[PDB]
RNA sequence: UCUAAGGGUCGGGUACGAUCAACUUAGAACUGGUACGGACAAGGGGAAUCUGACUGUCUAAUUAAAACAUAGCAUUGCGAUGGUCAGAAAGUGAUGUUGACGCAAU
RNA sequence: GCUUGUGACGGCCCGUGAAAAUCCACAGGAAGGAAUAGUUUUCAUGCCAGGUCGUACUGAUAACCGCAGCAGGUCUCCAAG
RNA sequence: GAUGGGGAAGCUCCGUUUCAAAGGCCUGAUUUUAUGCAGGCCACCAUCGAAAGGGAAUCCGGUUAAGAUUCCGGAACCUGGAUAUGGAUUCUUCACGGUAACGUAACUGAAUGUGGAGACGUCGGCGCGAGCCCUGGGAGGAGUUAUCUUUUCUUCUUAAC
C-alpha cells in the first residue's frame, strides 16, 4: 500500500526485524517521448503494508541490488 | 408586461373554489410570503416558515409572530397595554 | 450494454444501499456499494459547519488522530471562532460592567 | 451517413418534425446560452478596460 | 343495531393522537423555590413548530439551582418573543411579554397566556394559536384573581396561579380558507383520525339514529338530552336554543 | 490617549492564545513590510497558575504557581484594550522585534518573562492578570 | 442542393487577428404520376335542457351515478371536580405531547 | 445526450417532513508527572485473536398463492443503437 | 410486555415508572488474604419489536459438474487484547508555528457539564462527477470485395486500500 523514494529510509526496511521477503520487478518503459529505459521496483513486504520504491535509473539499481541483505529472501523478477 | 388583471398570486388556483375564497386567500398569501423588516438589525430580511414563526435571513434572530403576518393587530395593542400597565409599577 | 446486479441480499433502493458503477481490471462493470456521505460537524454556537475539522461518519472519528478533531484555539473543534471572539468580548465586558454595578450601589448605600 | 446529412441540415423540414419547437430545444436553454455570453463579454471588456465599470453595470442590467 | 361512530372513538384504536413528530408537551417550569420567592432567568434558545399545533413552541433553557446542569423547558411562544430573549419567571419578576408571573402580581387588565387552573399545574388556560386571558379582578382576602377566559367565561382562581405575559403566537391562522379537501386532509393527518365525516343522515339505521328513510332526514328532533344515553347522543346535545344566532353576541 | 501604549493590558481575542491576557510591551502603531498593519508585541500568560488553597502545602503550592508564558506579534485588531495596566520594565529588552525570528532567542525571552510573571504573582501584584478569563 | 443568423479558446503599451467544436431556426433554388406527421404514432366538433360546483370516494364478483366526501356556511356541547366516548371492575382508558384560533356532536 | 450521484440555490405548507444504540469534541482541572533522568501510545512500526446461525436454486405463461407445469395474482435494482 | 402494586369468584384484566426500601461503576483501601471497607459519584428503573430504518471493517484476479465480496492468489481494513522499539515531549515540565482564518506525525487530562455526528419533506431549473452513449488517429483480429468503400464489425482494461 506504499510508495517510497528516500533510498536510505528504504535500506532500513530491508533490515526491519519483521521484514522477511523482498521482491524486485523489472519493466520495459519509454522515456520523455523518444527512446525507452529499464525501470526497476523494489518491493518489501511488511506485516501490515507493502512498500515499493521505484528506482528509474538502471545504474542506481545495480548497486542497490547488491546492497540487499544477504539474509533477505528476495524474489527475482 | 402585466401578466394578469387581478388574481395575482392566486392565479394558481385557476377557476376553482370561486372568486371570494380565492380573494380571501390571496390577501393572506401576500401577507405570508412577503419580506419584512428585522426589528433587530434593520434589513428587510424576515420571511415566514410555518405559521407563527418569523426568522431573519442574516443575523438569524427568530420572532414568534402572527400566523400569516408578523405583528398581529392585537399583539401590538397588547404590547402597548403592557407598556402602559408596567409603567404604573415603577411610577 | 452491460448491466449490473446488487452485490448484497437487500434488493431495494434504501439510503443504506446506494450503488456506484466501476470498471475492474477484468475489463468489466461491477456494482460497488457506497456508504452514506459524512456530514460536516457543526458549531454549537451559531451553527455553521466548523472549519479545520475533518468530516467523517461518527465512528470513523475513533480512528483518526486528535488533530483531525480540533483546531487549536480555546473551544477548539467545538465553536466557530467568530463565535468564540463574541464570547471573550462579552465575558470581559459583562465581568467589567459587574464591577461598575457594585461600586455604584455601594455609593447608593452611603448616599440615600 | 444519415447523421452527416442531418448535420448537413437535411431531413429537418416541417414534415420531419414531431416534437414541439419547445421540446426539440427549450426556449430557456437558448436564453441561458445567450445571456451567459453577453454576461461574460461584459466581463472581459471590464477586465480589459475597453469598457468602464459604470457603462458595464448599465449594460449588465440592460442585457 | 351497530355501535355508532362516536361510541367507537372512545376505545382509541384508530382514533388516538398522532403524537410521533411532536416536540414534547408544553409546560411551565415546575413551581419551585425560585419561581415563588423570587424570579429565575432563562433564554429562549429556539422557537419552533409543533406538528398538529397551531402556535409555535419556545425552547427556553434555565440553570438548575441544585445541580450544575441545564434544564430545558418547553413553552408555548407568545407573540413577539424571540430567540436570545431573556425570560423571567417568578413572584418578584417584572412585567414584560414572555415573562411568567403569578396572576396575583399583575395589575388588572394584564394580558397573559398559558395560565394555570391551580397553581403549579404548569399551565392550562389559553394555549391555542391566538388565545389569552385578561385579569379583571383581585381579592386579597383568600388571594384570588379573576380572569375572563377566551371562551368569554369568567373564572376565579388563586393568585399564586402562574401565567405568561402576552398573547400566544400564530394568531389569525383560522382566517385562511382551507380551500380544498387536501389542506384539511393534511391538517388532520398530523392531529387525529377525525376526517372526513360521513353524515348520520347518509347511513343506514344500524349505523345511526339518523340513518335510513326514503329521503334523507333526521326524522325526529335533533336536539338530544343531557341525560341521553350512549348511542343516543348525536346531533345537538343539551341545546338550549338553536337556529341562526340572529343578534349580537358577547357576554354581558 | 493613543491608548494602545507602553503597559496597556489586553485580552487576545483571536489565535491560539485567544482569551489570554497580555501586556503590550512595544507598539508598531503603523507599518512593517513584514507586518503591514497596526500591531503590538506582547508578553502573555498561556498556562495560568491554578488556584491555591490552605489545604495546598509545601511543594504543591510550588507547582500550582508555575506559569507558562508566551510572546506574540499581534494585530491591534485582535486585542481588547483593558482598563487595567501592568509594568513591563523587567523585560523591555527581552521582548523585541529582534527577539522574534530565531527561535533560540524567543525561547530565552520567555524564560525571563516567566521569571518576571512568577515573581509578580507571589506578593500578589496585579492579581487580575493571573485570574484566567472565563468564557 | 444551396444561403444567411446564433458560440469557445488565446497573446494586445501601462481596431482586429488566429483557429477548435456543436444541431437548431428562417429563407432560396432544383425535383417527382401533387407525393411527403407516407409505416408507427395521434383530440371529432358545435348549440342547448337536467344534474353534481370542482379534484377525489364506493357496492371485490350484475348499480361509478345525480349517490359519499370536500372546501365554504350554520347550529350544539364543553374551563378539566369538564364535554364526548371506553370498560365487569379498578390507584382503569381514548380525546390528551390536548385547552375554546381547542376537542367533541349535528 | 442517457442514467445515476452530488452541490449551491429556489417554490410549497392551518403539512415544516422519526427514534435509539453508538462515535467524537470541547468547557473543567481531580490528579499524576523529570535532569542525572521522567512523562507520554489519539505519531510510526511491531504480536495475538475474531464465536454462533444463514449462504444451493426458483422468484414465475412450470420451483410462490389460485385443487394443477391455471392467459389470473404476487414488492424491487441494472437498462445498448 | 414481565415487575411493587390495584381489579377480578376465577381463567385473568389494569398499569410500564406506575403510590416501590427497585441498582453498578470507578478506583482506592490489601501486601494476615483475598477481596472485606474507605471516597465519590450515577438514579437510568425490565425486556421483545426492522434479513427495506440506524449501524465498526474487503477488494480485484483466478477457480467449481454444482460454492463463492465466503475457496485459492495478492493486496487491505475494523474490533478486542496485549505491548516493546523508534520518534515526539520535558531543566520554562504537560509541543511549536501563523497578525488571522488555522497548521501539524505526535503533542498528559478523573468527576462533572456541554456541543456535534447518528438524523432525516417535496418539487424546479442551474453547476460538477461517474458509468453509458457518440467520435479522431494508431496498433491488431475478423467480415465484404463482379463493382464500390484509406471500409464494416471488434480488442486497446485498471479494484478496495
Ligand atoms: Mg446476491
Ligand atoms: Mg427518496
Ligand atoms: Mg485541524
Ligand atoms: Mg484536516
Ligand atoms: Mg487546557
Ligand atoms: Mg419560458
Ligand atoms: Mg460564455
Ligand atoms: Mg444591479
Ligand atoms: Mg350493538
Ligand atoms: Mg398516543
Ligand atoms: Mg379517515
Ligand atoms: Mg360530510
Ligand atoms: Mg359534517
Ligand atoms: Mg362540514
Ligand atoms: Mg345509503
Ligand atoms: Mg337506530
Ligand atoms: Mg332517536
Ligand atoms: Mg332517517
Ligand atoms: Mg336532507
Ligand atoms: Mg457560422
Ligand atoms: Mg469564429
Ligand atoms: Mg362530481
Ligand atoms: Mg372526476
Ligand atoms: Mg359491483
Ligand atoms: Mg353482495
Ligand atoms: Mg366515475
Ligand atoms: Mg360496473
Ligand atoms: Mg353556498
Ligand atoms: Mg382502587
Ligand atoms: Mg430509478
Ligand atoms: Mg425545512
Ligand atoms: Mg466530531
Ligand atoms: Mg484534591
Ligand atoms: Mg495508534
Ligand atoms: Mg464473549
Ligand atoms: Mg446464490
Ligand atoms: Mg422457472
Ligand atoms: Mg403451488
Ligand atoms: Mg399462471
Ligand atoms: Mg400486562
Ligand atoms: Mg431487539
Ligand atoms: Mg437491521
Ligand atoms: Mg438496514
Ligand atoms: Mg470472481
Ligand atoms: Mg467445490
Ligand atoms: Mg450459481
Ligand atoms: Mg483471502
Ligand atoms: Mg497478506
Ligand atoms: Mg489496536
Ligand atoms: Mg513538534
Ligand atoms: Mg450528547
Ligand atoms: Mg443532533
Ligand atoms: Mg431516518
Ligand atoms: Mg464498445
Ligand atoms: Mg471500502
Ligand atoms: Zn436581522
mmCIF file of C-alpha atoms (C1' of nucleotides) in Angstrom, chain I residues 33-130:
data_model
loop_
_atom_site.group_PDB
_atom_site.id
_atom_site.type_symbol
_atom_site.label_atom_id
_atom_site.label_comp_id
_atom_site.label_asym_id
_atom_site.label_seq_id
_atom_site.Cartn_x
_atom_site.Cartn_y
_atom_site.Cartn_z
ATOM 1 C "C1'" U I 33 -5.674 -12.816 52.073
ATOM 2 C "C1'" A I 34 -8.051 -12.368 49.076
ATOM 3 C "C1'" U I 35 -11.434 -9.035 48.433
ATOM 4 C "C1'" G I 36 -13.881 -7.113 53.499
ATOM 5 C "C1'" C I 37 -14.369 -1.231 53.536
ATOM 6 C "C1'" A I 38 -12.698 3.517 52.573
ATOM 7 C "C1'" G I 39 -14.346 8.447 48.986
ATOM 8 C "C1'" G I 40 -17.445 9.917 45.458
ATOM 9 C "C1'" C I 41 -20.369 9.746 42.006
ATOM 10 C "C1'" C I 42 -24.902 7.660 38.642
ATOM 11 C "C1'" A I 43 -30.660 7.457 39.772
ATOM 12 C "C1'" C I 44 -31.007 5.300 34.315
ATOM 13 C "C1'" C I 45 -35.849 1.971 36.716
ATOM 14 C "C1'" A I 46 -37.135 -4.616 32.807
ATOM 15 C "C1'" U I 47 -37.440 -6.989 28.283
ATOM 16 C "C1'" C I 48 -39.449 -8.058 22.864
ATOM 17 C "C1'" G I 49 -40.365 -5.428 18.443
ATOM 18 C "C1'" A I 50 -36.681 -3.713 11.436
ATOM 19 C "C1'" A I 51 -32.783 -10.039 6.873
ATOM 20 C "C1'" A I 52 -36.079 -2.114 3.191
ATOM 21 C "C1'" G I 53 -34.971 2.339 9.251
ATOM 22 C "C1'" G I 54 -29.984 3.266 12.353
ATOM 23 C "C1'" G I 55 -25.161 0.532 12.030
ATOM 24 C "C1'" A I 56 -17.140 -0.886 13.190
ATOM 25 C "C1'" A I 57 -14.337 -3.065 8.962
ATOM 26 C "C1'" U I 58 -12.591 -6.225 1.856
ATOM 27 C "C1'" C I 59 -11.189 -5.542 -2.819
ATOM 28 C "C1'" C I 60 -9.543 -7.164 -7.547
ATOM 29 C "C1'" G I 61 -7.816 -11.508 -10.443
ATOM 30 C "C1'" G I 62 -8.353 -16.928 -10.752
ATOM 31 C "C1'" U I 63 -11.047 -21.309 -9.599
ATOM 32 C "C1'" U I 64 -16.185 -25.385 -9.450
ATOM 33 C "C1'" A I 65 -20.361 -30.632 -12.671
ATOM 34 C "C1'" A I 66 -22.849 -27.599 -8.813
ATOM 35 C "C1'" G I 67 -19.994 -22.505 -3.876
ATOM 36 C "C1'" A I 68 -18.113 -18.022 -3.610
ATOM 37 C "C1'" U I 69 -17.337 -9.772 -1.544
ATOM 38 C "C1'" U I 70 -17.323 -16.949 1.947
ATOM 39 C "C1'" C I 71 -12.351 -21.019 -1.505
ATOM 40 C "C1'" C I 72 -7.291 -20.012 -3.720
ATOM 41 C "C1'" G I 73 -3.935 -15.822 -5.009
ATOM 42 C "C1'" G I 74 -2.466 -10.829 -3.797
ATOM 43 C "C1'" A I 75 -3.244 -6.550 -1.612
ATOM 44 C "C1'" A I 76 -6.284 -4.203 2.785
ATOM 45 C "C1'" C I 77 -9.230 -2.619 6.673
ATOM 46 C "C1'" C I 78 -12.092 -2.959 11.716
ATOM 47 C "C1'" U I 79 -12.773 -4.516 16.741
ATOM 48 C "C1'" G I 80 -10.794 -6.555 21.226
ATOM 49 C "C1'" G I 81 -6.402 -7.817 23.616
ATOM 50 C "C1'" A I 82 -1.710 -7.464 24.627
ATOM 51 C "C1'" U I 83 2.782 -4.492 24.237
ATOM 52 C "C1'" A I 84 8.129 -3.130 23.013
ATOM 53 C "C1'" U I 85 11.345 -0.444 19.891
ATOM 54 C "C1'" G I 86 11.912 4.276 17.125
ATOM 55 C "C1'" G I 87 10.011 9.171 17.004
ATOM 56 C "C1'" A I 88 7.788 13.265 19.763
ATOM 57 C "C1'" U I 89 7.890 15.789 24.745
ATOM 58 C "C1'" U I 90 10.393 17.932 29.468
ATOM 59 C "C1'" C I 91 15.889 21.859 33.175
ATOM 60 C "C1'" U I 92 10.434 27.364 31.008
ATOM 61 C "C1'" U I 93 7.773 20.357 32.674
ATOM 62 C "C1'" C I 94 2.247 18.640 30.001
ATOM 63 C "C1'" A I 95 4.700 20.875 21.573
ATOM 64 C "C1'" C I 96 5.558 24.573 18.179
ATOM 65 C "C1'" G I 97 4.434 27.726 14.154
ATOM 66 C "C1'" G I 98 0.681 31.684 11.567
ATOM 67 C "C1'" U I 99 -1.403 39.083 12.520
ATOM 68 C "C1'" A I 100 -5.676 35.756 11.412
ATOM 69 C "C1'" A I 101 -8.987 32.207 9.412
ATOM 70 C "C1'" C I 102 -5.742 27.979 11.072
ATOM 71 C "C1'" G I 103 -1.177 24.383 10.526
ATOM 72 C "C1'" U I 104 0.911 19.534 12.248
ATOM 73 C "C1'" A I 105 3.320 12.791 12.779
ATOM 74 C "C1'" A I 106 2.844 13.208 17.874
ATOM 75 C "C1'" C I 107 1.969 16.871 21.492
ATOM 76 C "C1'" U I 108 -0.905 14.031 29.759
ATOM 77 C "C1'" G I 109 -6.308 15.214 31.461
ATOM 78 C "C1'" A I 110 -10.543 11.754 36.557
ATOM 79 C "C1'" A I 111 -15.629 13.613 38.365
ATOM 80 C "C1'" U I 112 -18.978 16.624 36.114
ATOM 81 C "C1'" G I 113 -21.004 19.696 32.215
ATOM 82 C "C1'" U I 114 -21.917 20.811 27.131
ATOM 83 C "C1'" G I 115 -21.624 20.504 21.648
ATOM 84 C "C1'" G I 116 -21.735 17.829 17.334
ATOM 85 C "C1'" A I 117 -22.333 13.407 14.401
ATOM 86 C "C1'" G I 118 -26.172 9.304 14.013
ATOM 87 C "C1'" A I 119 -30.600 12.398 11.903
ATOM 88 C "C1'" C I 120 -33.960 12.830 8.001
ATOM 89 C "C1'" G I 121 -40.137 16.652 3.351
ATOM 90 C "C1'" U I 122 -41.052 17.523 -1.611
ATOM 91 C "C1'" C I 123 -40.704 19.567 -6.454
ATOM 92 C "C1'" G I 124 -37.898 23.127 -10.086
ATOM 93 C "C1'" G I 125 -34.077 24.956 -13.035
ATOM 94 C "C1'" C I 126 -28.769 25.623 -12.929
ATOM 95 C "C1'" G I 127 -23.376 23.517 -11.741
ATOM 96 C "C1'" C I 128 -19.901 19.366 -11.325
ATOM 97 C "C1'" G I 129 -18.828 13.886 -11.075
ATOM 98 C "C1'" A I 130 -19.249 8.799 -12.616
#
